[PDB]
Structures are given as structure tokens and as C-alpha cells.
Amino acid sequence: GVIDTSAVESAITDGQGDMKAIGGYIVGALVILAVAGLIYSMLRKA
Amino acid sequence: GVIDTSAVESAITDGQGDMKAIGGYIVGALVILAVAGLIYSMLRKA
Amino acid sequence: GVIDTSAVESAITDGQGDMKAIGGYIVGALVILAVAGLIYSMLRKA
Amino acid sequence: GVIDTSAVESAITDGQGDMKAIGGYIVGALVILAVAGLIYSMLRKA
Amino acid sequence: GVIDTSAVESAITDGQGDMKAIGGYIVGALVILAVAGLIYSMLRKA
Amino acid sequence: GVIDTSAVESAITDGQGDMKAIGGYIVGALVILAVAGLIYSMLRKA
Amino acid sequence: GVIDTSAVESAITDGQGDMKAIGGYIVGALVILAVAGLIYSMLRKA
Amino acid sequence: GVIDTSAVESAITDGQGDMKAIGGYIVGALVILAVAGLIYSMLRKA
Amino acid sequence: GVIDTSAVESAITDGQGDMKAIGGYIVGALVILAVAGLIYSMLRKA
Amino acid sequence: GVIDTSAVESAITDGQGDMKAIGGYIVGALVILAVAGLIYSMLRKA
Amino acid sequence: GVIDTSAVESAITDGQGDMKAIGGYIVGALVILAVAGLIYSMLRKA
Amino acid sequence: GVIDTSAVESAITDGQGDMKAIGGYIVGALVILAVAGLIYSMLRKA
Amino acid sequence: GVIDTSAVESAITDGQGDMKAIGGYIVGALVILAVAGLIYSMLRKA
Amino acid sequence: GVIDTSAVESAITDGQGDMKAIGGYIVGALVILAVAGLIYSMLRKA
Amino acid sequence: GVIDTSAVESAITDGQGDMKAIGGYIVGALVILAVAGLIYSMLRKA
Amino acid sequence: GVIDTSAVESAITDGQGDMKAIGGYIVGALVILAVAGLIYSMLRKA
Amino acid sequence: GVIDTSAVESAITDGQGDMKAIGGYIVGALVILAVAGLIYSMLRKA
Amino acid sequence: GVIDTSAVESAITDGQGDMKAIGGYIVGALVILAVAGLIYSMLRKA
Amino acid sequence: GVIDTSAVESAITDGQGDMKAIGGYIVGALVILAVAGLIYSMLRKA
Amino acid sequence: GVIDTSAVESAITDGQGDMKAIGGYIVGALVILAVAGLIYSMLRKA
Amino acid sequence: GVIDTSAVESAITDGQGDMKAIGGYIVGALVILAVAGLIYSMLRKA
Amino acid sequence: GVIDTSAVESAITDGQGDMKAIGGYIVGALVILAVAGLIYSMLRKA
Amino acid sequence: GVIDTSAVESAITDGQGDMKAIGGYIVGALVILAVAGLIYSMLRKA
Amino acid sequence: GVIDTSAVESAITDGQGDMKAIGGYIVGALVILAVAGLIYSMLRKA
Amino acid sequence: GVIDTSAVESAITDGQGDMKAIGGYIVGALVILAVAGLIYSMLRKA
Amino acid sequence: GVIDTSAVESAITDGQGDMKAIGGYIVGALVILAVAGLIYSMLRKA
Amino acid sequence: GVIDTSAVESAITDGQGDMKAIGGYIVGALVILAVAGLIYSMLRKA
Amino acid sequence: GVIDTSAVESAITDGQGDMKAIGGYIVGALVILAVAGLIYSMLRKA
Amino acid sequence: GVIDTSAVESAITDGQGDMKAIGGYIVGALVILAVAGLIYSMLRKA
Amino acid sequence: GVIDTSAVESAITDGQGDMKAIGGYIVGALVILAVAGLIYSMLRKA
Amino acid sequence: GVIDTSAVESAITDGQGDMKAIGGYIVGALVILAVAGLIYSMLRKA
Amino acid sequence: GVIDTSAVESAITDGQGDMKAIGGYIVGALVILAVAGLIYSMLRKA
Amino acid sequence: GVIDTSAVESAITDGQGDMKAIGGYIVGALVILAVAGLIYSMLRKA
Amino acid sequence: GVIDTSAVESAITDGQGDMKAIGGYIVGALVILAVAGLIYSMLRKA
Amino acid sequence: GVIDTSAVESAITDGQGDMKAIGGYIVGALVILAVAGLIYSMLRKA
């Protein structure tokens, strides 16, 4: 007997993939915010 | 008399197996989410 | 199986864009403040 | 003997289809929310 | 067989719409706050 | 997808404007102070 | 289908209004402080 | 043969109606909360 | 058929009311804080 | 021949009635819960 | 025929009552928290 | 239906009160500092 | 019928009590901080 | 003819009784949880 | 007839007990956090 | 919808008032210092 | 959008005015000192 | 019912204590700075 | 009946312990910062 | 006559036993989670 | 009779183990964040 | 409801006290400096 | 609303007073110096 | 039984890594700001 | 807006007055010296 | 597993760059101020 | 990624310009004072 | 960007003007003193 | 049970270390500034 | 409960120490300046 | 509550002491200069 | 409120005293010089 | 764990360097001023 | 890392230059005064 | 804990050194001026 749950082992993988994808771009934006701090809070006076 | 329910003792085992399998990959993804937190909420400002 | 999260890879990009846009003009103003310091705190006496 | 359950193998497929369809648009909206965060919480001060 | 879930593909769209609508006006207000900072924290002394 | 942040590109501009406006009059006053120095610290004895 | 979120497009507007209102009077006070500086730090000696 | 389930096609409609009704007023209140934020977190200092 | 959800359309209204009520007094207090700033940070030296 | 099942067509109606009756008061209570949310999660801070 | 469900129309009412009762005292406490904020975050410096 | 939030309209008032109370004494002290300046920075030489 | 929820009307009261208790001592400490400011930022030079 | 089902009219009553009994103590505990929230999420910072 | 549900009236009590027990120690820890704030955010500068 | 922030438009006014009040007396003292200079630095020798 | 900072363009003007006012009288006194020199340091012997 | 928050009434006290402790030594140092001013800005020339 | 929650009364204790541990070292560092202020803002000029 | 259901009175007892057993270890784990919160959300900043 | 639930008493233990494992590394990262604060917000100016 | 902030009305008073105390001794020293001027800048030649 | 800053209008007055007081005695001494000139620079030869 | 959470013990490590990476560069920038202070606030006059 | 600096226009006047007063008596003495020359440096021999 | 945060290692670099850029020009201006001192406070008399 | 801070490299330049402009005229006046010395302190007697 | 400092280039000019004006009359008087020497120190005997 | 937070007791130590390191070099620079004062403001004239 | 802040009572002491140390040497230099005055402004002519 | 600032009342006293000490020796030297005048500007011719 | 500056009214008096003291002895010496003239510029020839 | 702050130990060094550099040239100019005094205030008459 | 302060090493040089320039012409004039003495105080009688 | 400020105890020493160095040469020049007086104001006639 059985239940072919190998289609899972891949289906979930996509997930991790797509996730890690957004899990990048989010950071991608926040850097902008970071750089936007320190640089303009140097221009603040210096 | 009897009822040969030894085919069960294995059939159910597969289950536990396939389960524990998904019971891994789920965690597999959630780690991504974890790392995605702390790291980008370090980049937050620091 | 899948989940077409490629509409994300662009949607988030706009964000970075619009952000970096404000992330400019903010600095755009603060310069004014900078110049407003040193120049009038030269006129201070000199 | 038998029971022609091949009409199932397709009927369920539609399901997955229609599902994955909503399973997209949901994400479609949440991106909006994401972009709405970071960008306006850049405009927050910067 | 089927389930006509095309009424969804539009119903959800409205959502994104109305959302992006508020997702604008929110920023609309926060700008006011931004301008209210830098300008009066120029008037601060200068 | 998007977020119409073009209302920003102008809203912030006003700021710079109003700022540069005060960023003038401040200097406008300090000149008075300058002239008030040198001239009366000529009258000091000469 | 829909969700009548037009009551929003106005409700938020009031906000911007009331905000910009305080966003004025705040500056209204800080000017007092400004004038209170330069003028009495002219009277300082001159 | 049959089962006159056309009384359904309307009975369920009412539902959607009454729902969308509350589905409005809920938002109706949350706007209040929104406006209550930004405006008083402008008055915060500005 | 139906479900008399008109008792809702009013019950929720009270909410908005009571809310907007607190949504006032909160601001009522924060003004105190505002005035407490600028005035005593005028007395700071001036 | 026959079976006078017209006493049914009414007996079942009562049911729908009494049901719709409770089917009201249930909602009657849940509104209380709704109002109890938003209003006190306005008082939360605001 | 019938089913005397009028004992319901009252039994449920009590509920709403007892609910609205707790639905008060909860707010009763949260005010304390509110006042505890603004007042001591005035004492913060002022 | 309702939620007796009139206990709020007073509870918050106390707050404003106690606040305005500290909002006085703070200034009460800073005057001391003010007088301590000008008078001893008269004694400075004169 | 009923549900004796009068044990609530008191149980919640304790809460408010214990809360208001901490809601005092917190302020109790922050005063220390306040006094620690103004007094030593008088000793700052004066 | 008959069937003495008056022993029911009481047997079921006990039920309601014992029920309402647990239907109290359950709430009895949940209050503890309630008080445990607000009070310690006052101690949270305040 | 009956159902001896008096073993309940005690079993549930233990619960409240054990609960209130954790419902203490939780607060027990959070105080530590509180004290850890104010004291070191006095040492912050003072 | 709305938020009655007209109590602000006055509350802030008081501020400006009380401010301008101190914003006078400060100058009131500094004149003393001014007169104390020139007159005694005439008596210096003459 | 905007921030009506035209009340500034005048408020600051007063300043310049009041300043230039003292910026006169100061010189007004110093002349006295000047005349007091040369004339009595003519009377010195001649 | 209850929640033994008397362990708080002491835990917070320690805080005030340790605070007031640093709240002393800080001043302890700043005096040094004070004395270091006036005395050496007497030695300045005298 | 029961639930042996005495393993809690200790498990939570560790927490408080480990916490208070970090709750020390944090302060341990901030002192460094304190000393780093006053001492070098004595060396500032003195 | 009869039915020896005393084998029940014990069989069910085991149940309660084994249950209360898991009914412990579950809590056993959740404590870990609790301690994992407060302690690391002390390390959060403190 | 029985149900061999001793395989539980261990299965759950693993859980606590693996948990406490992540319950460490999480803190492991947050320290990094802590150190990243204080040290660079010493470098801030000092 | 309330928050006993009368412990403040005194705590702040001490402050004013201790302040005015240093606010004396500072002047106490500066007199020394004053006398040290005029007297030795009489001895200057006379 | 308000902030009782009438305690200021007097507190500052004292200042002017004490100032004008020293603002006298300073001149009080300088006369001595004046008389010490002319008289002994008459005795110079005459 | 088990759950292979060893993929965690590494996944989280990366996090710490990438974190400590940004946890460097942040400081990397702030030094620039530091050097930009002291050096140009030496050039200030010296 | 404004700053009532008319109290200045008089305060400074007093100065000029008191000055011109000493600005007389100084000359008053020097005449004595003048007369003391020529007359006794006539008596010199003649 | 991972999170490609190498886009950071460069994004932050730009920051340092742009910063150091302003971190130059600021000094660029202050020199002007320096030269403007010494040279004209040579012309002062010499 | 980036932040277009080239608008700075010019904005600051203007500053230096306008500065150097006043940095001239200041000297422009002081020469007058110089010439006013030596020439009339030649006319002094010669 | 800019800062209209052309109002300076004239404001300072007035200064030079008014200065050179007094820078004349001073000499205007000193000539009197010159002539008063040589002529009466000719009349001295001759 | 537990949570091995001993990796903290060291991780935080590094912090203090690196801090105290910068907490030195900062002073290292400021001395330069100190020496740069007194020595060249000896060369000032002496 | 507690927070071992005795490591503070010493850490701050060092500060006072190191401070008083520089608080000496500063004076150490200024004496040089003092002696450099009077002695060479004796050699001035005598 | 309080802040033991009695360590001040003495710390400042030392200051006055050490000051008055230098405030003597300065005069101590200037006498030398005085005597050095009159005596050698007797020897001048007599 | 106040600042006990009565310790001044005496401290300054001493000054006048000590001054007038030297303001005597200076004349005390110059008489010697006077007598030394006329008498020996009688002995000159007579 | 760690944070590579060795890039600091050098970055700050540059600072000291560049500083000491300006910390030279400043003196470099002031000498000019010194020499410009004594030499031309020898030419004064000699 | 760095800060290109080589633009300083020249900017300051100009200063020294322009200074030494005026540092000449000043002497240039004073010679005139010198020659104007001795020569006409030869013509005095001879 | 500590802050190695022993690099100060030497850095400041250099200062005193370099100072005393200029504190010599200044006198070195003034002697020239002294000798230039008496000797040529012997040659004056003798």
C-alpha cells in the first residue's frame, strides 16, 4: 500500500524558491532605506 | 479464527513516513522566513 | 505545480523605484538646510 | 468489475487549477500591501 | 465538470483597486507630515 | 501594479520652496546684525 | 461584486486637512521662537 | 424529475448583500482609526 | 427568505461614534503635550 | 389514492421561521463583539 | 405543529447582556492603559 | 445596542489634568534655569 | 436561563487595580529621570 | 394510551443544570486569562 | 436520574489554580524587563 | 466622517501667547544687561 | 498640497524691524561715548 | 480571583533605587566639569 | 484530577535568570558609553 | 441479570492516565516556547 | 486493557529538544543585533 | 478611574530645590571672579 | 486647555531685579576707579 | 520518531553570517560620519 | 505675530541719559585739571 | 538554504561613497570660513 | 542601487560661492576701519 | 537650488557707507584738536 | 529545561571591547583638538 | 528580583578619575599662559 | 524621592577656594608691576 | 521662586573696599613723587 | 561571534592625521599675525 | 576610508598669503607715521 | 571597566611644551623692544 507524496517534495520546494525570491527583494528595498538614512543624516549637518 | 491485520502495521507506517517527510519540508520553508526576519530586521537600521 | 510569483519581482521593483525617488527629494531638501547653515553662519560675524 | 473514476482525475484537476488561480491573485493583492509599506515607511521621515 | 470561478478573477481585482486607492491617500497624508518636518525644522533656527 | 507617488514629487518641492523662503529671510535679518556690528564698532572710537 | 470604499477617499481627506491645519500652527509658533532669537541676540550686545 | 433550487439562487444573494453591507461599515470604522493615527501623530510633535 | 441585518447598520454606527469620541480626547491630550513643548522650549533659553 | 402531506408544507415553514429568528439574534450578539473590537482597539493607543 | 423557541429569544438576550457587560469593563481597563501612556510620556521629558 | 464609553470621556480627562499638572512644574523648574542664566551672565563681568 | 458572569465584574476590577498600581510606580520612576535631567542640566554650566 | 415521558422533563433539566455549571467555571478560568493580559501588557512598558 | 459532574467543579478549579500560577511568573519576568528599561535608559545619558 | 480638531486651533494659540509672553520678559532682562554695558563702559574712563 | 508659510514672511519682518530699532539706539548711545572722548580729550590739555 | 502583583511593587522599587544611584554619580561627575570651568576660567587671565 | 505544572514554576525561573543575566551586561556596556561621554566632553575644552 | 461493566471503570481510567501524561509533556514543550519569548525579547534591545 | 502511549513520552521529548535547539540559535542571532546596536551607537558620536 | 500623580508634584519640587541650590553656588563663585577683576584692574596702574 | 505660565511672569522679574542689583554695585566699584584716576592724575604733577 | 531539524542549525547560521556582514558595513559608514565630525569641527576654528 | 520691544526704546534711553550724566561730570573734573595747569604754570615764573 | 545579501555589500558602499562626497564639500566650505577669520582678523588692526 | 546625490555637489557649491561673497564684503568694510585708524592716528598729533 | 544672498551685497554696502561717514567726522573733529595744538603752542611763547 | 544563553555572556563582552576601543580613539582625536587650542591660543598674542 | 548595578558605581568613578586627571593638566597649561602674560607684560616697558 | 546633591555644595566650594587662591597670586604679581612703575618712574628724572 | 543673590551685595563691597585701599596707597606714593619735584626743582637754582 | 571593528582603528586614525594637518596650518597662519604685531609695534615709535 | 582634506592645505595657504599681504601694507603705512615723527620733531626746534 | 586616557597625560604635555616654547620667543622679541626704548631714549638728548 502507499500514497505517492513525492509530488509534494517538489511542490513545497517551489514555495521555498518563490519565497526566498521575495525574501530577497524585500531586503533589496530596505537597503535603499538604509542608504537613505546614513547618507542624508550626514548631510544633516554632517 | 482471526483477521490478518498485519498489512495495517505497515500501511500506517508509510503514512508516518510520508508525513514526517512533509513534516520536514514545512519547517524547511519556515526557516527561510526566520532568516528573512532577523537579517532584514538588522538591515532595518541595524 | 507552482504559484506564478513573477508579478511580484516587478511589483516590488516599482516600490524600490518610488522609494529611491523620495529617497532623493528628501536629500534634495536637506541640502537647502545645509547651505542655509554654513552660509548664514559665516554672515554670523564671519 | 470496476467503477469508472477517471472523470475524477480531471474534475479534481480543475479544482487545482481554479485554486492556483485564486492562489495567485491573493498574492497579487498582498504585494500591493508590501509596496505600500516600505515605500511609505521611507516617506515616514526616510 | 467545473466550478465557474471567473467571477473571482474580477472580484479580487476590485480589491486590489480599492486597496491601491487607499494605498495612495495614506502616502498622500504622510507627505504632509514630511514637508511639515524639514520646513519647520529649518525654521527651528535654520 | 503601482502606487502613484508623483503627488510626492511636487508636495516635497513646495517644502523646498517654503524652506528656501525662510532660508532667505533668516539671512535677511542676520545682515542687519552684521551691519550693526562693524558700523557701531567703528563708532566704538573708530 | 464590490466594496464601496469611496467614503474612504473623503474620510482620509479630512485627515490631511486637519493635519495641514496643525501643520501650520506648529510653524506658527516656531516663528515666534525664531524672532525671539535673532532680535534678542542683537540686543545681546548687538 | 428535479428539485426546485432557484429559491437558493436568491436566498444566497441576500447573504452577499447583507455581507457586503457589513463589509462596508467595518471599513467605515477603520477609516476613523486611520485618520485618528496620522493626524494625531502629526500633532505628536509634527 | 432573508436575515434582518439592519440592527447591524446601527450597532456599528454607535461604534464609529464612541470611537470618534475617544478619537477626539486622545488628540485633546496630545495638544497639551505639544504646547508643553514649544512653550517650555522657548523658556529653554528662548 | 394519496397521502395528505400539506400539514408538512406548513410544519416546515415554522421551522424556517424559528430558525431565521435565532438566525438573527446570533448576529445580534456578534455585532456587540464587533463593536467591542474596533472601539477598544482604537482606545488601544488609537 | 410547532416548537416553542421563544425561550431562546430571551436566553440569547442574557448573553448579549452579560457580553456587553464584559464589553464594558474591558474598555474600562484599557483606558487606564491609555492614561498611563500620554501622562507618563509627558513626564518622559515633557 | 451600545457600549457605555462615557467612563472614558472622564478617565481621559484626568489624564489631561495630571498631565497639565506636570506640564506646569516642568516649566516651573526651567524658569529657575532661565533666571540662573541671565543673572549670573550679568555677574559674568556685566 | 442564564450564565452567572458577576464573578467577572469583580475579577476584571482586580485587574484595573493591579494595573493602576503598576501604572503608578512606572511614573514613580520616570520622575526620578525627570529630576535627574533638569537638575544636572543646570549643573551642566547652569 | 400514553407513554409517561415526564421523567424526561426533569432528567433533561439536570443536564441544563450541570451544563450551566461548567458553563460558568469555563468563564471562571478565562477571566484569569483576561486579567493576565491587560495587566501584564501594561507592565509591558505601560 | 443524573450525571455526577461535581468532579468537574474541582477539576476545573485546579486549572484556574495552575493558570493563575503561570499567570504570576509571566508577570514575574516582565518586571525584570521593565526595570531593565527605565534603569538603563537613565544610564542612557540620564 | 471627521475628527473635531478645532480644540487644537485654540490650544496651540495659548501656547503662542504664553510663549510670546516669555519671549518678551527675556528681552526685558537683556536690556538691563545692555544698559549695564554702555553706561558703565563710559564710566570705564569715559 | 502645501503648508501656508506666508505668516512667516511677515513674522520675520517684524523681527528685522524691532532689531533694526535696537540696532539704532545702540549706536545712539555709543555716539555719546564718542563725543565724550574727543571733547574731553581736548580739554585734557588741548 | 486575583493575580499576585505585589512582587512588582518591590521589583520596580529596586529600579528606582539603582536609578537614583546612577542619578547621583552622573551629577557626581558633572560637578567636576563645573569646577573645572570657573576655576580655570579665572586662571584664564582672571 | 490534575496537570503537573510544577515543571513550569522552574522552567520560567531559568528564564528570569538568563534574562536578568543579559539585563546586566546590557547595562554593563551602556556604562562604557556614559563614561565615554562625560570624560571626553570634559576633554572637549573642559 | 446484569452486564459486568467494571472492566470499563478501569479501562477508561488508563485513558485519563495516558491523557494526563501527554497533557503534561505538551505543556512541557510550550514552556520552552514561553522562556524563548521573554528572554530573547529582552535581548531584543532589552 | 491499555494503549501503549510510551512512544509518546519520547516522541514529544525530541520535539522539546529540536525546539530548544532553534530556541538557542534564534537568540544566537539576536545577540549579533544587540552588539550591532550599542557598539555602533557609541561610534554614533560616542 | 485615576493615576495618583501627586508624588510627582513633590518629586519635581525637590528638583527645583536642588537646582536653585546649585543655582546659587555658581553665582557664589562667579562673584569671586568679578571682585578678582575690578580690584586687580585697579591695581593694573589704577 | 492651557499651561499656567504666570509663575514665569514673576520668576523672571526677580531675575531682572537681582540683575539690576549687581548692575548697580558693578558701577559702584568702577566709580572708585574713575575717581582714582583723575584725582591721582592731577597729583601726577597737576 | 523524529523531525530532521538539522537543516535549521545551518540555515540560521547563514542568517547570522549575512547579518554580521551588514552589521559591519553599517559601522563602516558611521565611521565616515565620525571622522567627518571631529576633523571638520577642528577646522571649525580649531 | 510680534514681540513688544518698545520697553527697549525707553530702557536704552535711560542709559544714554545716565551716560551723558557721567559724560558731564568727567569733563567737570578735567576742567579743574586744566585750570590747575595754566594758572600755576603762569605762577611758574609767569 | 540562503538569502542573497551581496546586493547589500555594494548598495551600502554607494552610501559610504556619496557620504564621503558630502563629507568633503562640507569641509570644502568651512575652510572658506577659516580663511575668512584669520585673514580679516589680521586686517582687524593686525 | 543608488541615491542621486550629484544635486548636492552643486547645491553646496552655491553655498561656498555666496559665502565667499560675504567673505569678501566683510573684509571690504574692515579695511575702511583700518584706514580710519592709521590715518586719523597720524592726525592724532602725527 | 540656491539662497538669494544678493540682498546682502547691498545691505553690507550701506554699512561701509554709514561707516565711512563716521569715518570722516571723527577725523573732522581731530583736526580741530590738531589746529588747537600747534597754534596755541606757538602762542606758548612762540 | 533551559536555554543556553552563555554564548551571550561572551558575545556582549566583545561589544564592550570594540566599544571601549572606539571609546579610546575618539578621545585620542579630541586631545589633538585640545592641544590645538591652548597652544595656538597662546600664539594668539600670548 | 534585582539588577546588579554595582559595576556602575565603580565604572563611573573611573570616569570622574580620568576626568579630574585632564581637569588638572588643562589648568596645568593655562598657568603657562598666565605666567606668559604678566611677565612679558612687565617686560612690555615695565 | 530625591537626588543627593549635597556632594555638590562642597565640590563647588573647593572651586571657590582654589579660585580665590589664584585670585590672590594674580594680584600678588601685579603689585610687583605697580611698584615697578612708580619707583622707576621716579628714577625717570624724579 | 528666587536666587539668593545677597551674598553678592557683600562680596562686591569687599572689592570696593580692597580697591579703595590700593586706591589710596597709589596716591600715597605719587605724593612722594610730587614733593620730590617742586622741592628739588627749587634746589635746581631756586 | 563578533563585529570586525578594526576598520575603525584605522579610519579614525586618518581623522587624527588630517586634523593634526589643519592643526598645524592654523598655527602656521597665526604666527604671521604674531610677527605682524611685535614688529610693527616696534615700528609704532619703537 | 578617508576624507580628502588636501584642498585645505592650499585653501589655508592663500589665507597666509593674503594675510602677509596686508601684514605688509600695514607696516607700509606705519613707516610714514615714523618718518613723520622724527623728521618733524627735529623741525620742532631741532 | 575603564577608558585608557593615559595617552592624554602625554598629549597635553607636548602642548605645554610647544607653548612654553613660544612663551619664550615672544619674550625673546619684546626684550629687543625694551632695549630699543631705553637706549634710544638716552640718545633722545640723554
Short mmCIF file of N, CA and C in Angstrom, two decimals, chain X:
data_model
loop_
_atom_site.label_atom_id
_atom_site.label_comp_id
_atom_site.label_asym_id
_atom_site.label_seq_id
_atom_site.Cartn_x
_atom_site.Cartn_y
_atom_site.Cartn_z
N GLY X 1 10.90 7.93 16.45
CA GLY X 1 10.25 9.07 15.74
C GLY X 1 11.22 10.24 15.75
N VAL X 2 10.93 11.30 14.99
CA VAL X 2 11.81 12.48 14.92
C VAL X 2 11.26 13.52 13.93
N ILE X 3 12.09 14.54 13.68
CA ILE X 3 11.84 15.62 12.73
C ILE X 3 13.25 16.18 12.52
N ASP X 4 13.82 15.88 11.35
CA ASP X 4 15.17 16.31 11.00
C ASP X 4 15.36 17.80 10.87
N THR X 5 15.56 18.44 12.02
CA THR X 5 15.77 19.87 12.10
C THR X 5 17.24 20.16 12.33
N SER X 6 18.05 19.72 11.38
CA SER X 6 19.49 19.95 11.41
C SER X 6 19.76 20.89 10.25
N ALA X 7 18.80 20.96 9.32
CA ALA X 7 18.86 21.83 8.16
C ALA X 7 18.64 23.24 8.69
N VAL X 8 18.08 23.30 9.90
CA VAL X 8 17.85 24.57 10.59
C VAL X 8 19.20 25.09 11.11
N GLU X 9 19.84 24.29 11.96
CA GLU X 9 21.13 24.61 12.55
C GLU X 9 22.15 25.24 11.59
N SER X 10 21.88 25.15 10.29
CA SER X 10 22.76 25.74 9.30
C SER X 10 22.05 26.93 8.67
N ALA X 11 20.79 26.75 8.29
CA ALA X 11 20.00 27.80 7.68
C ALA X 11 20.04 29.10 8.48
N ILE X 12 19.99 28.96 9.80
CA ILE X 12 20.01 30.10 10.74
C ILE X 12 21.41 30.73 10.83
N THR X 13 22.41 29.89 10.65
CA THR X 13 23.80 30.27 10.68
C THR X 13 24.06 31.27 9.56
N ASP X 14 23.58 30.95 8.35
CA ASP X 14 23.73 31.84 7.20
C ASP X 14 23.26 33.20 7.66
N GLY X 15 22.05 33.21 8.22
CA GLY X 15 21.45 34.42 8.72
C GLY X 15 22.46 35.21 9.51
N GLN X 16 22.94 34.65 10.62
CA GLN X 16 23.92 35.31 11.48
C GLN X 16 25.04 35.84 10.63
N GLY X 17 25.47 35.03 9.66
CA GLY X 17 26.53 35.46 8.77
C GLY X 17 26.14 36.73 8.04
N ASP X 18 25.17 36.63 7.13
CA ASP X 18 24.70 37.78 6.35
C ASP X 18 24.44 39.02 7.24
N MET X 19 23.96 38.77 8.45
CA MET X 19 23.67 39.81 9.40
C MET X 19 24.96 40.46 9.79
N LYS X 20 25.83 39.68 10.40
CA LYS X 20 27.10 40.22 10.83
C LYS X 20 27.76 40.97 9.67
N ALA X 21 27.46 40.57 8.43
CA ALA X 21 28.01 41.22 7.25
C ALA X 21 27.50 42.65 7.18
N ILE X 22 26.20 42.82 7.24
CA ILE X 22 25.63 44.18 7.21
C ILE X 22 26.02 44.87 8.51
N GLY X 23 26.10 44.07 9.58
CA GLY X 23 26.46 44.56 10.89
C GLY X 23 27.86 45.09 10.92
N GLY X 24 28.53 45.04 9.78
CA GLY X 24 29.88 45.56 9.68
C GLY X 24 29.77 46.84 8.89
N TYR X 25 29.41 46.71 7.62
CA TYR X 25 29.25 47.84 6.70
C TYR X 25 28.47 49.03 7.27
N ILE X 26 27.52 48.77 8.18
CA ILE X 26 26.78 49.87 8.80
C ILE X 26 27.80 50.69 9.56
N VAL X 27 28.58 50.00 10.38
CA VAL X 27 29.62 50.65 11.15
C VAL X 27 30.60 51.25 10.17
N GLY X 28 30.82 50.55 9.07
CA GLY X 28 31.73 51.04 8.06
C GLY X 28 31.38 52.46 7.66
N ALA X 29 30.09 52.73 7.52
CA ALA X 29 29.68 54.06 7.12
C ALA X 29 29.75 55.00 8.28
N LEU X 30 29.15 54.65 9.40
CA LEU X 30 29.20 55.56 10.53
C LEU X 30 30.58 56.09 10.90
N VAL X 31 31.65 55.37 10.56
CA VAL X 31 32.99 55.86 10.91
C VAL X 31 33.18 57.11 10.11
N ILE X 32 32.89 57.02 8.82
CA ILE X 32 32.98 58.15 7.91
C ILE X 32 32.35 59.38 8.59
N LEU X 33 31.14 59.21 9.10
CA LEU X 33 30.42 60.29 9.78
C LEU X 33 31.27 60.78 10.95
N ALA X 34 31.83 59.87 11.75
CA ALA X 34 32.66 60.24 12.92
C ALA X 34 33.82 61.12 12.54
N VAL X 35 34.59 60.64 11.57
CA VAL X 35 35.77 61.33 11.08
C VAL X 35 35.34 62.67 10.50
N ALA X 36 34.19 62.67 9.84
CA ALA X 36 33.64 63.88 9.27
C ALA X 36 33.28 64.91 10.36
N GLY X 37 33.11 64.46 11.59
CA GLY X 37 32.79 65.40 12.66
C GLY X 37 34.07 66.03 13.12
N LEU X 38 34.71 65.38 14.08
CA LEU X 38 35.97 65.83 14.66
C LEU X 38 36.93 66.55 13.73
N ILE X 39 37.09 66.08 12.50
CA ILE X 39 38.04 66.76 11.64
C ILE X 39 37.53 68.10 11.19
N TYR X 40 36.26 68.17 10.81
CA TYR X 40 35.76 69.46 10.37
C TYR X 40 35.32 70.35 11.52
N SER X 41 35.29 69.78 12.71
CA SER X 41 34.98 70.55 13.88
C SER X 41 36.26 70.61 14.70
N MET X 42 37.26 71.00 13.92
CA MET X 42 38.64 71.24 14.28
C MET X 42 38.83 72.40 13.29
N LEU X 43 38.51 72.15 12.03
CA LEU X 43 38.57 73.19 11.02
C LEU X 43 37.56 74.33 11.40
N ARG X 44 36.58 74.02 12.28
CA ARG X 44 35.54 74.97 12.77
C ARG X 44 36.07 76.35 13.13
N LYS X 45 37.30 76.33 13.66
CA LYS X 45 38.07 77.50 14.10
C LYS X 45 39.40 76.80 14.37
N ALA X 46 39.23 75.71 15.12
CA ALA X 46 40.23 74.74 15.59
C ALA X 46 39.81 74.36 17.01
#
